[PDB]
Design a protein around this ligand. Structure first.
Ligand SMILES: Cc1ncc(C[n+]2csc(CCOP(=O)(O)OP(=O)(O)O)c2C)c(N)n1
Ligand SMILES: Cc1ncc(C[n+]2csc(CCOP(=O)(O)OP(=O)(O)O)c2C)c(N)n1
Ligand SMILES: [Mg+2]
Ligand SMILES: [Mg+2]
Lengths: 806, 806
């Protein structure tokens, strides 16, 4: 449960004191000085004479175009938090403005507790300057290593979705989301603007989107800054926002006047926020107009105006680093020296190098600090879910009528399980889906909650199961759901989100970024506590896209996911749900897990059920297991072939092929691989099953016929080192598909039961079984011709049921 | 060069005749009848008695929620084209409305020329009805098999970028881009709205975005339809559009009145289009307000109102298929029969089943038809580029001073080459880049063209190289560039686009879709002529992300790309530019190629040059080649190890390791793999090099040490079948990185020269070379400590130059 901190939504009811604004100005100066020292300095932080080119870093790496504006905003936000005691977490959308965040963490004090070696004196200042973007130091971007960070910012376009996710079910949290004007050009952010139609002011917090309209991208102006101001205000007001505009730094106005003006504007916007919050207590049915700030400043606002006769301040030339070589020429070093002295550090630092007390006297303290805020470190907030007992949802007909019984839809069991999880954990668990929950048969959750929808309502005939507050969020944008869920987990909550398989690639970048957030966390960041796992239910897979066809059949998500399994981080888990019971075991494991990305591939089509819950759990605790009941060989030596499968449709095809093989006297073994990553090399992955266990499951001499869900490429690239890998004959998706009957789909990919039977015969004796192979190959064509002639699959294919059903 | 067709931008200067609107109404009726027959009917197309449940398809597959609105729009657009003779290509954003497009193709006649077996009579009508979404038929979506299609519509959010790309450098082309309201929620489309700031009305065509605001997604209402109309108009006017609104079908108004009203509204919008075009001839500096149409209609507009007491028309329940089982119950069959008879097909079809002449008397003819428009079939327009002679750009210092000379930046040579290509081919070649052309060192193109930018201008100090018309387009959105380039190629033009490596994943979906467009084209669509290849210059790769760090280091693009190499389609090419000359050869091959996706991975960092242009061409014509000069073994038998590399940084590390090995007397071979797909299995890929050639390059017994750019997983999954695959020891990216010196980057991934030397020693004799291995492993740590202490890489690492430089 998200905690309430301080006194949320209080109006100041007084003008901002002059001492507070003096503190803000001194903070801005000292923060800019630290941001410059990090990029350029390495030694002699206080410029004690002699200050020479020796003290400049050899390789100048970093960004400065956005840093001073971020320092300005952060200083004013710090004054605001100190005055009001608001629960605040800052989303820094331009993550390349890393020095701003690191400077804030150093100034508020949190960086010293987090890293004790960086003291608050001259030596600590020297280390702090040196370590930025340094070999063995800290990253340039606003990184997980930085206290008070929940958004990396490497990628662009996910600041707004992250802010809105952070405020969901968090009524007392205020999130100022700083957005780069160039970042606003990205596709994800343009639809993230429209995310105020899915949050309720009473049940959720408040997001204040601060558009950092500095004018330029890297070597390019931004579209937003160059269109007319009337167009900008009209555009923002068309998306349910009330635009306020602040303009500074474009003339010779004194800095203290700028601080006064921003104080007044900020207090006005805060008054509208408090009015919205107070209104939401009584009326929360009709959507308000959330204010948003348009912050127009020159890029690299405080840097020297001209360098080599080139306009630097207020241009794109200041994005990465002005003074690209301040160590190679004397004129550049003099420019840098004057730039550093312009902030007058002699009055900002005491004799010992500590920032003077009166500079930070206005700073917030305790839990209120951005660095120490719990919503930044979502691990400490996180509490484990209350999970319903699993046997309540087990499919018991398997244990009575035998394996392979029925035509159940696999995902409905997960739907019921998640419904009861929501029932036990309201306001703490949430389901996302890009318009596809009902298609993924997860609608069982609607019995205990509603779809959160804050746009207009028209009629009851079409608005079933929607409400202003709910635990289900839908919007046709995978970026929205991914960002929402990542932010939701990063703040300490839990959730799951489901999608079509081919469309998960839309968020291939996003997943990667989260993986990078986890890999960085597990390796070198002990103080960042574990967060809940990100659960992605991939459904409506390639093998059953009847209505859509070729455009919707892309199983390549696994190929992307495997790229992130290195160095025993275990941040990735890929699970294949053979049936409903296997799905239950997988989901239970995933919901108990932490610091992982769990992709559960389950089909929504009517499929048989093979395992009991105990059997499924036993298979899952190893990752792959031999089905003793399905096999005909009592020992490894007897088997003439091993049929291994991963995925529901491949499992069905393998079992159907096994039935035909059993009529021919073939001794074969049957293996099901629930978890893909268990097949990884033992010495590479300690959690992966050992080579001895692998050899026990797959005998060395016996050929192995593997039927796989995704492309065979990723499996073959995974088992290269394993014993008997050369005998594996993997059959996977082969980029063949259309709108056609289910038998045709598996036929054109050579994964059907008849082709699998012919393959298993060929690994034994093509010469002995030549006639049978000819008959099977003829029958494939005859069955396809039957589907063409009569419009549906063959009675042989459709009516087939396993011989073990009682 | 894009041709001029008909009489572009003519005002009608007369009211629409009543006979034309009668024709439009009859067209709408017959098109809806055909769309229903495709989804439901299997036989007896004209409902000749007896009409029973036998004639209904067993498996009802398709979409109807968007079909009638598309039929309405297409009928009115057809009347418009017939009246004005405009050059028009329709982008159908809701691609799931396939029956609309197929019905249009059948009605205008083009489908009969394209597929002669589908005659225009009762038997042809029966075949046309049966083949939709059928085994051995045609896909459900608006597919490449459908004449007059350039956008699949499978994925959502790329209609606007495709339209804007289609109109670039096409002054006479008018593109009505139909956009689904649910599709407008997607991230790519929200930023595609802002694409009118990058097109010039004089030099480009006109896009008319038709927002198909039918209200609902699948089982969910849309955000756009539920916000207030004032908000909608304000939002669209804030993005430089003039919104016109049409509302129909929500009451009992007669259909003919709806047709009259839409005729008047369409003519008004066309008058504003013609005014904009006429103005652009004299003044094209200031941006106009392009009109856009908001088309509010009930979803599944003409279907029965209620089915099972559930609101079907005007709801989300009609998205895929109303009457989900019209074959299983008599009441459902009666509902379907009445639905079919409501269109009165008895007067729309003659005795022989041909659509009556007076129904299509208003139709356009010849090249003007949407099916027969050349801009739909971009292959016939396409003409080969005028390529400058290659030796003009060869780096000649290699042939004089020896291999490995210099510190040139690889991509600058490509910059000069593309500059001269633009010079020879203006208005036909175009460069795209998500704000990264100057970072990718492609700015040499600015000497002959400008960045196209139609937003406001402020000053010359910051607006260098921008102009209202240019051959370079920049906007911080990879979706924009990918869609622009795909549409540009699909209409017959050529282009290239460059990007950071980690961010190509942002368009992982888009690439896949284009691959699907190509694979479908090469296999079964002969009448679709080849289009220009899509060239993606991947630069600023993982090994040299000094400023950004861990967030920007993701080489997984190759893993996605390999998933699309099946069945000898050869739609994918991955090339690794070792140096400038190799890059020139690669680019020449790519620019001459057709129907491919070519990913050229070249580094922007200062790197040595190894090959002459003839040598690079010789290596490229095989894909992998043995460097005879670098090797020490004259024959395959002598070598104790083979050092193979793919990529510039891996090549540098391999050569540096070879220099250290040569001092120890080791006989080794050196191999460079320019093209990855040449390593694919010979029997799988006919273009891939044979197993005999592979064995010649890599001897069977000798161990092979492979240094790879991307993850080792994809390489190992590619060479499973090849001889001596078990001896390969691939070293690739291992998810280790930060902001640090270049030596550290390759050190933490165990791909540096010292680790490679130790590895190559270990494949020979760990026991003999134990002391040398210990010394190398100590030296790695000492060199990293030097970088930590002094801030830059070791003099041993930095100052090293190949021993073959004269
Ligand atoms: C999708 C994407 N494309 C490109 C980049 C490379 N990049 C890093 S920072 C940056 C510029 C950011 O522009 P803007 O939003 O204007 O930021 P600011 O001016 O505040 O630095 C770019 C393009 C990226 N991070 N993400
Ligand atoms: C990114 C993405 N997510 C999901 C889908 C699945 N899908 C196919 S059609 C469709 C509904 C389209 O909605 P809308 O734009 O309102 O279309 P219309 O009402 O005209 O059918 C969806 C969600 C998709 N094609 N692309
Ligand atoms: Mg900016
Ligand atoms: Mg719609």
């Amino acid at each position: 449960t998200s905690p309430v901190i301080g006194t949320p939504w209080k109006k100041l009811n007084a003008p901002v004191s002059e001492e507070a604004l003096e503190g803000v100005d001194k903070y801005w100066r000292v923060a800019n000085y630290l941001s410059i020292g990090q990029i350029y300095l390495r030694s002699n932080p206080l410029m004690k004479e002699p200050f020479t080119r020796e003290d400049v870093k050899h390789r100048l790496v970093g960004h400065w175009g956005t840093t001073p504006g971020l320092n300005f905003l952060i200083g004013h936000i710090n004054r605001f938090i100190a005055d009001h005691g608001q629960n605040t977490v800052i989303i820094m959308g331009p993550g390349h403005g890393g020095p701003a965040g690191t400077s804030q963490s150093y100034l508020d004090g949190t960086y010293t507790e987090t890293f004790p070696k960086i003291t608050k004196d001259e030596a600590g200042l020297q280390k702090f300057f040196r370590q930025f973007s340094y070999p063995g130091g800290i990253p340039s971007h606003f990184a997980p290593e930085t206290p008070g960070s929940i958004h990396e910012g490497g990628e662009l376009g996910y600041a707004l979705s992250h802010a809105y996710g952070a405020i969901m079910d968090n009524p007392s949290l205020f999130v100022p989301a700083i957005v780069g004007d160039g970042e606003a050009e990205t596709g994800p952010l343009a639809t993230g603007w429209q995310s105020n139609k899915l949050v309720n002011p009473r049940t959720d917090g408040i997001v204040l989107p601060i558009l950092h309209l500095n004018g330029y991208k890297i070597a390019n102006p931004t579209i937003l800054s160059r269109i007319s101001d009337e167009e900008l205000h009209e555009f923002f007001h068309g998306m349910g926002y009330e635009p306020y505009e602040f303009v500074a730094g474009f003339d010779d106005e004194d800095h203290m006047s700028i601080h006064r003006r921003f104080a007044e504007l900020w207090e006005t916007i805060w008054d509208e926020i408090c009015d919205i919050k107070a209104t939401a207590q009584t009326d929360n049915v009709h959507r308000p107009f959330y204010p948003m700030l348009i912050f127009r400043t020159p890029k690299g606002w405080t840097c020297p105006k001209y360098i080599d006769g080139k306009k630097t301040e207020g241009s794109w030339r200041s994005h990465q680093v002005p003074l690209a070589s301040a160590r190679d020429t004397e004129a550049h070093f003099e420019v840098l020296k004057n730039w550093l002295e312009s902030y007058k550090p002699e009055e900002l630092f005491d004799a010992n190098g500590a920032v003077k007390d009166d500079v930070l006297a206005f700073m917030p303290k305790g839990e209120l600090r951005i660095g120490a805020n719990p919503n930044a470190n979502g691990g400490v907030i996180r509490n484990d879910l209350k999970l319903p007992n699993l046997e309540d949802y087990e499919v018991k007909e398997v244990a009575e009528y035998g394996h392979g019984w029925g035509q159940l839809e696999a995902t409905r069991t997960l739907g019921a399980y998640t419904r009861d999880i929501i029932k036990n954990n309201p306001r703490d668990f949430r389901i996302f889906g890009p318009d596809e929950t009902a298609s993924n048969r997860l609608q069982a959750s609607y019995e205990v909650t509603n779809k959160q929808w804050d746009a207009g309502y028209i009629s009851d005939e079409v608005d079933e199961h929607m409400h202003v507050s709910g635990q289900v969020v839908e919007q046709l944008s995978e970026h929205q759901m991914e960002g929402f869920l990542e932010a939701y987990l990063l703040t300490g909550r839990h959730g799951i989100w489901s999608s079509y398989e081919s469309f998960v690639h839309v968020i291939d970048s996003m997943l990667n970024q989260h993986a990078k957030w986890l890999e960085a966390t597990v390796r070198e960041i002990p103080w960042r506590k574990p967060i809940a796992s990100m659960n992605l239910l991939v459904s409506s897979h390639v093998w059953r896209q009847d209505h859509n066809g070729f455009s919707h059949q892309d199983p390549g998500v696994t190929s992307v996911l495997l790229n992130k399994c290195f160095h025993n981080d275990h941040v990735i888990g890929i699970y294949f749900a053979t049936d409903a019971n296997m799905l239950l075991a997988i989901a239970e494991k995933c919901y108990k897990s932490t610091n992982k990305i769990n992709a559960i591939i389950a089909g929504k089509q009517p499929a048989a059920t093979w395992l009991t819950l105990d059997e499924a759990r036993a298979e899952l605790e190893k990752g792959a297991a031999a089905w003793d009941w399905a096999s005909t060989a009592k020992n490894n030596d007897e088997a003439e072939v091993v049929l291994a499968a991963a995925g529901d449709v491949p499992t069905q095809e393998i079992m159907a092929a096994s039935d035909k093989l059993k009529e021919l006297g073939v001794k074969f073994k049957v293996v099901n691989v629930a978890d893909l990553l268990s097949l990884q090399s033992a010495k590479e992955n300690d959690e992966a099953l050992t080579d001895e266990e692998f050899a026990d499951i797959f005998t060395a001499d016996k050929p192995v016929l593997f039927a796989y869900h995704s492309y065979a490429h990723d499996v073959r690239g995974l088992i290269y080192d394993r014993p008997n890998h050369d005998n594996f004959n993997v059959h996977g998706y082969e980029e063949e598909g259309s709108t056609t009957t289910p038998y045709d789909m598996v036929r054109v990919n050579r994964i059907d039961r008849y082709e699998l039977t012919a393959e298993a015969l060929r690994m034994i004796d093509a010469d002995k079984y030549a006639d049978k192979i000819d008959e099977l190959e003829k029958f494939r064509d005859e069955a396809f011709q039957f589907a063409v002639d009569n419009g549906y699959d063959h009675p042989d294919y459709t009516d087939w049921v396993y011989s073990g059903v009682n």
